Amino acid sequence: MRAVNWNKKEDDFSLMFWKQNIAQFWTEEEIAVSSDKNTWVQLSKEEQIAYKRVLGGLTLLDTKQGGEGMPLVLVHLENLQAKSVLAFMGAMEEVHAKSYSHIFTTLATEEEIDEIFDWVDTHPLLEKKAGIITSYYRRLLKPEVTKKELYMAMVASVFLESYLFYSGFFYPLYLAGQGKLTASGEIINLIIRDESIHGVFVGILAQQIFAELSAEDQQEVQKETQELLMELYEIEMAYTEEIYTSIGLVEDVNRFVRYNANKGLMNLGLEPKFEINPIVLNGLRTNHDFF
Amino acid sequence: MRAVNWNKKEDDFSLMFWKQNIAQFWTEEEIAVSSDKNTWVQLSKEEQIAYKRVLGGLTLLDTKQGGEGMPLVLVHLENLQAKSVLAFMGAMEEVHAKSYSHIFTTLATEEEIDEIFDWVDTHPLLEKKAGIITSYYRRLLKPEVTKKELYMAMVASVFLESYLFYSGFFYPLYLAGQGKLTASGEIINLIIRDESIHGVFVGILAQQIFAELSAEDQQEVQKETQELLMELYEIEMAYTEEIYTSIGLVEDVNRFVRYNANKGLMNLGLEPKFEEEEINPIVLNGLR
Ligand SMILES: [Cl-]
Ligand SMILES: [Fe+2]
Ligand SMILES: [Fe+2]
Ligand SMILES: [Fe+2]
Ligand SMILES: [Fe+2]
């Protein structure tokens, strides 16, 4: 049985991503959020509800990535250096999820917080969205998986990392780009810096597996991938309508979702399939290069 | 579908262990090991070989805990705060494994290192002991697991964290307690501080699952746990004889193995099964 041996490179990129994930390490204890209350109380009721709801959705996604997506992909990898990187990325998803709780504690009462998590648990679109992604993960709960099954779990992971979070990230960035809730915005920028490299890394791994598939299996997962992209898009468009109609931002968020969908595809070595709001860009400017 | 909500405690201990695991965070670049070369070259070849072999074994166990043990146990937990802690602990196993490679790079040539890892991969006792533990983990590769299956994976994990590492930790601590390889010994001490809390935590989880079993299932896993403990002990005694006979330390490391087996039992809420003895005072000085 093999032990991980970092003296013998297993690929040309795992050490670089190991080192970068470590260099980027942070915890919620490092950004105090209390100074955001001065601008939080200046938001309308409808704006505050949208903010809390999107943070709830982001928490759900990070919960499933750290608790299912990273663990189940990594258990089936044969490359032990890449496995190490994914284990670390999975832990950072739990840091991210804890960081949303840190923001909530500063901005909401204990009663309001528990209402938000109850709304998350019973929300039909979030359930559908998370269910579609985790289905591909839970296919890997068996002793032996095919490369097609592993490839599609990696696709699902890239689409969560590079695409599904962004209908939620939009709003903290949009407010931060206006000088509102800028400490929470700093946290969301740290999260985005991590998710960006998670999506690139899993995409590299996916491209390596794809090259190992037969031509028949390549064409099958190419079709499944495009269908998944558009199945998620349909749900995201319904989600943006629900969250953002009250505050007038639906079409802006949809453009941002398409931008990031295109990035997810590029992380998989795939051509864009769709066509950034400048205020969002200013909110990233504290990432700005990446976008 | 539920998101982790740290505002609402799921249990009385996960936040405490989350905070401590974070507080203890460290990485491989924080301890330079090059100053150990002055004492490394004073060791005989037999002493050097034993050191490299036990580090190889430790690396194997950490590879399996980060890549199978923590991920598969955590996937099946319902407690999302406990899941978080286990994910972090799994990442720290990978930090531990990376740190062993750092030690190797300072103390061995590239050809020597690859020889060690080929020795690990083809070693029959390491393959056997890792296989016994990972068999419990790989039973969890199915959509739904029973609580009996989850419990026995947690037992295996506590036995790895609190017991199977220590036939290997012995020698770095023994040398560090003599002023030899003391920078490598500081790394090993950081790893031990982590494994100690990993074993306590998984043991708490195991005790929670045990209480949720029927009497019939309790009787089954109680017996399996005791058999597993002694099945692993028989393998560890062959392993210590293989590694340490050349350097005169077999009975010393066997005493340390039994000490730590007892701690693994206590982490599971179980009584000690081996004669209770004070720790070797040289090893104790290496832990200081
Ligand atoms: Cl295959
Ligand atoms: Fe995340
Ligand atoms: Fe991520
Ligand atoms: Fe470890
Ligand atoms: Fe551990």
Automatic annotation (TrEMBL), chain B:
Which one GO biological process term can you cite for this protein?
deoxyribonucleotide biosynthetic process
Residues annotated as binding Fe(3+) 2 are 93, 161, 195, 198
Indicate the residues that form the catalytic site. Answer: 100
The record's listing under InterPro entries reads: Ferritin-like_SF (IPR009078), RNR-like (IPR012348), RNR_NrdF-like (IPR026494), RNR_small (IPR033909), RNR_small_AS (IPR030475), RNR_small_fam (IPR000358)
Q: What is the recorded name of this protein?
A: Ribonucleoside-diphosphate reductase subunit beta
Q: What does this protein do?
A: Provides the precursors necessary for DNA synthesis. Catalyzes the biosynthesis of deoxyribonucleotides from the corresponding ribonucleotides.
Query: Per the similarity annotation, which family is this?
Result: Belongs to the ribonucleoside diphosphate reductase small chain family.
What does the note accompanying the cofactor annotation read? Binds 2 iron ions per subunit.
Binding residues annotated for Fe(2+) 2, in chain numbering: 93, 161, 195, 198
What residues bind Fe cation 1, as annotated? 62, 93, 96
Keyword Manganese listed? The answer is no
Q: Enumerate the catalysed reactions.
A: a 2'-deoxyribonucleoside 5'-diphosphate + [thioredoxin]-disulfide + H2O = a ribonucleoside 5'-diphosphate + [thioredoxin]-dithiol
Amino-acid positions noted as binding Fe(3+) 1 in the UniProt annotation, renumbered to this chain: 62, 93, 96, 195
Q: Per the record, GO CC terms?
A: ribonucleoside-diphosphate reductase complex
